[PDB]
Amino acid sequence: KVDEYGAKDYRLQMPLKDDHTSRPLWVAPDGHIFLEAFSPVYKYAQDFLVAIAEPVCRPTHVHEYKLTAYSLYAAVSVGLQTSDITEYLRKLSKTGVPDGIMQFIKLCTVSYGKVKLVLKHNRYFVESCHPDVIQHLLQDPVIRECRLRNSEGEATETVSFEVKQEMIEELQKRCIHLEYPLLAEYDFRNDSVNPDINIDLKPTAVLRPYQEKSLRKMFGNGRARSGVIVLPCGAGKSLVGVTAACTVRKRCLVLGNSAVSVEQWKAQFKMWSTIDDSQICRFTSDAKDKPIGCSVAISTYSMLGHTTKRSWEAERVMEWLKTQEWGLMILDEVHTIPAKMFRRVLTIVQAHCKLGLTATLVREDDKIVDLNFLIGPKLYEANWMELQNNGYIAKVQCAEVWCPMSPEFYREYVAIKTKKRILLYTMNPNKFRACQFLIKFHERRNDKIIVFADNVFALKEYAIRLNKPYIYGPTSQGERMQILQNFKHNPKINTIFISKVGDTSFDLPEANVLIQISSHGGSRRQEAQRLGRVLRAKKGMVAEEYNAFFYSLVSQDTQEMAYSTKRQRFLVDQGYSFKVITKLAGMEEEDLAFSTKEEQQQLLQKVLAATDLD
Amino acid sequence: RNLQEFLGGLSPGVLDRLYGHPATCLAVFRELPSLAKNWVMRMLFLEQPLPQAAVALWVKKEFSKAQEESTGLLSGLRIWHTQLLPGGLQGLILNPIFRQNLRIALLGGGKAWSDDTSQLGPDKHARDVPSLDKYAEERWEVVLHFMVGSPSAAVSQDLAQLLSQAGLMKSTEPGEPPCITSAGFQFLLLDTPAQLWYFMLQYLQTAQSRGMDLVEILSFLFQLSFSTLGKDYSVEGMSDSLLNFLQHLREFGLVFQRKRKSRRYYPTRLAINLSSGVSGAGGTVHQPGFIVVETNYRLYAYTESELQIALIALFSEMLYRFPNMVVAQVTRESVQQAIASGITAQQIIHFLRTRAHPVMLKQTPVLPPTITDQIRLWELERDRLRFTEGVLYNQFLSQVDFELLLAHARELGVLVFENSAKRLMVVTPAGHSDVKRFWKRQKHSS
Amino acid sequence: VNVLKGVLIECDPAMKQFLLYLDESNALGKKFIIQDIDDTHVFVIAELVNVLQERVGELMDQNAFSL
């Protein structure tokens, strides 16, 4: 029922009881859950909600969580039944639990844990304790095609049956249609085909309480379960992956975006794991290692997904990987997995336990529903604000600086209606002056400055005029490393211009000032992950609530305003504040470029000279 | 508008008649500045006029402006008056009626306004102070719900006639409930003491319409101001106009009365602070804040009365309606709609600050500064386009003629905008005729 | 003298350039922006200023996001 104001009239379906203050939860019949942080039982309520409910928004006071079938399956896999969950919900809900949600929970939980998929002898078997369900699912035409059949076309005969590897991902989606999702259960201790590996945990590795909780939730009843864990950048996600690999003790596969990710993972493994270097191999296009005796293999998705003809040695390595059975597989940056080529890598690679790690999961193409079965349900997601309070990460000071558009640019901005319009607002002389003043202020404050600009031309022009190093497409790796080392070590240079390649193509050195000038066009998750990766915790300013500085230069009255508003929605859902700054104090006293309007006319001439080709 | 501003604009006769009430004199003295209070106390027993120079020599030279402010306030209120002192001096002497009533109130004597209502003995149906306060709250809640138009609030027609005369709600179509205007929205967004003060000011501005004596009503209000909360008084001894005004106040909830024939009446705290207007009652213990504002522009209300729900929905998009909770979101569209309805940004900010939840009170800022700044920016967006009709003069051949015409226009005060560099100017359409005639006459004299 | 009767509009130079673009490109249709007087002031006939305000509001609506 909907009121005239648009509010959903849930009063009738929610019988309120007199235990208002003690119970902190509101359970609307639509599936949403509201929690008050100031309640004394917030910690218990937070722990209960995280286990069973997927959070939507976590601002300072009231948090909103959502109930999903995948979340219910994850809760069942943890070991919680319907009765205890219902009891805890009723003990915490201010109003009575609607029967619609109750029936929703009853239907999902009963159907969970019925169908099991086993990978043995490089063969996939579907088996269950209820042959009636198996017999019923045989009638499905999609399941008939996915089921492996004999060389003569005859179908193969807790009875299990072989399933085609190429149709595994198809079967995963069909399970949703049949309402019988598969079970990602692995024999953590009962495994015998794959021997253990001489790899342990160094004493220098310390697991933070949330990391330990996430690992223990993943290891349901002592058995590793496939899933996805979301952690903020810089929170030792690589350390968590190394710890999980050491715990598994089986064959380990790790996939990164580029060779830099492979090198970072190898360094972390050497830093925390006890596996010998001879058992660590890099299947990269430049630095190659023999796959013989490769206990842990680190590679990239595109290397395994190279549809074009590969090198002869790479073909041999791929054959060995296909022949080899992998107890554990590790995937980094899950948000790029929904791509079809990278999804095909999952079919190509035969692995028992698959764990995915990333910082964000809100794809702009919303291709995450299928991702819930490509790997599994989201195992854990840490609260950014809570970790900021714990001091594990820097408490970032975020600000959006509005740079007025010059009237000459503004008229041309309105005149242009095609994609060439990006250059006009990305090259605002007023924005240039604001960026120059910010750089001067932070250099006088002795701060590390990273200027991110997606547009190659704008980034190059800004870096050249400001006389700072610039990083763009080619960026020869030797020169890139030299620039990174100069930024890390040389105090004279503390301002680095980085193009779009700064997201995942290489490692971002720890800094404190990050200024974003150019936008992708609405990448609400990509730039958020970039911001998380750029800024890390800095000692000395732990007591202050503003130890990391992020500024977003946005052109007023332009489409960049809408892009920024759409993008910052994800960070606002995390409780991150954003202050709008229209006037910058100190620009009047400081001397900046383009002080005269004729200089801005020259910049306009230069920008117009850069046609739509750039 | 404060109480003294309305009092200062009254005719001398009304002020003289009000001076006959010692309670009125007490209220006036209490409303005076401290320097004015000292001056009045000095002149309480002075039967001789005081030379202006002697009065002026009392205060410091630096505080002359404050001294002049107090002198002007006293002169405007007609508390004192100037007399042609012998020898050409201009002495200052207090109003004999005002001074006599002040002495009666302070030193004693005279006659009590109320005839000791204890004659009737204890009240069989007496209430308690919390009950009186709750009833006062309920009546104003009914009035506000009726202003909203909810059928649950049914009030007297003449009460709606007062609102129509006040202009808050205009009866565009008779028979149907009147549509509340932008002024009504601004009145609703005001705090309850401010709403009561504005309503009473509007009633006073149209007091002569009902044939009610302004002097009697003001004196009765002043007497109620000093009345004791939880104590009844005698209805008897008042004119029929005063009885009707008391019944109106009872309808407002300011005065409690079980029956229209009852001889007792209990003034409420709202009526006590009514005379002071908006100030004076700095320690108002209002309802605890039930509104929680989150960084995602979300509002959570721990309220169930439809009045607050409607007030929140005036400038926000409702999302969920729980039995003990209301969840809405602050959106640019809703804010712009409220602005088009006449709602200003400051009223929303002040209202939200008033309803601030105790949890949010722990923070050093009462409300998130980013949200307030965003609301201010949304408000500033609406008035980006400045519309000013006028007549443009742009055909000036001589700079001297343009300067002369600009000087004449500024003398007339009809100038809208000037551009001396290009010899262009804008004048008001009403003043265009005068400037056109002056320009033609200048050519005629040439 | 030949003087026109209309409404004076005061806005920032960005809005002035937007109005000049609208008048020149004839997006508003007939050229109701007869003459400009100052770097921030324009003189518009009141017959079209109401529609012009709608066009300006459309511009700022596009430079925003719908929640």
């Binding site: 007025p404 | 500033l380 | 920032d12 770097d39």
Partner: peptide, 14 residues
């Protein structure tokens, strides 16, 4: 500097 420093968010704030 007059145009840039005080174009949109000054003619109402100041």
């Amino acid at each position: 500097a007059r145009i840039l420093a005080a174009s949109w968010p000054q003619n109402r704030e100041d």
